[PDB]
Amino acid sequence: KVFGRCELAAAMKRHGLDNYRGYSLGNWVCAAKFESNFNTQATNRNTDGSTDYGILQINSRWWCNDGRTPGSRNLCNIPCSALLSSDITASVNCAKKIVSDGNGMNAWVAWRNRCKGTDVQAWIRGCRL
Numbered sequence: 509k510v511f512g513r514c515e516l517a518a519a520m521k522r523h524g525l526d527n528y529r530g531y532s533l534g535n536w537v538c539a540a541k542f543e544s545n546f547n548t549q550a551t552n553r554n555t556d557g558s559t560d561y562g563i564l565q566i567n568s569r570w571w572c573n574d575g576r577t578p579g580s581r582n583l584c585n586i587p588c589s590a591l592l593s594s595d596i597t598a599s600v601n602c603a604k605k606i607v608s609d610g611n612g613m614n615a616w617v618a619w620r621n622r623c624k625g626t627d628v629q630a631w632i633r634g635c636r637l
């Protein structure tokens with residue numbers, strides 16, 4: 509599924525991301541925009557044997573198990589295929605873990621490069637929340 513901006517914002521709000529660990533909703537929407545272009549099926553296969561999965565491009569070395577990645581930790585305790593669903597629940601639950609495991613949103617390269625320091629409220633402006 510390719511989400512709309514406001515539709516994704518509402519889904520992320522329903523799942524408790526607004527102000528999760530001090531990150532406003534627009535940060536999460538911005539991260540998804542630049543990680544995956546709002547596409548739940550996005551995959552990026554890296555040369556290091558790992559793969560980034562889903563709307564938040566969560567990597568298979570630390571966070572989910574795909575059976576193919578060296579050094580797997582599976583800290584979210586999920587198969588990576590769960591991150592390719594049309595429903596965002598598994599991606600949101602794992603994203604919450606990423607931040608709870610002592611990372612901030614700097615764990616997402618697209619957040620740090622394209623969202624940090626910007627007016628991230630723009631990403632939820634005009635939306636029914």
Ligand code: NA
Binds near residue numbers: 543
């Ligand atoms: Na996309």
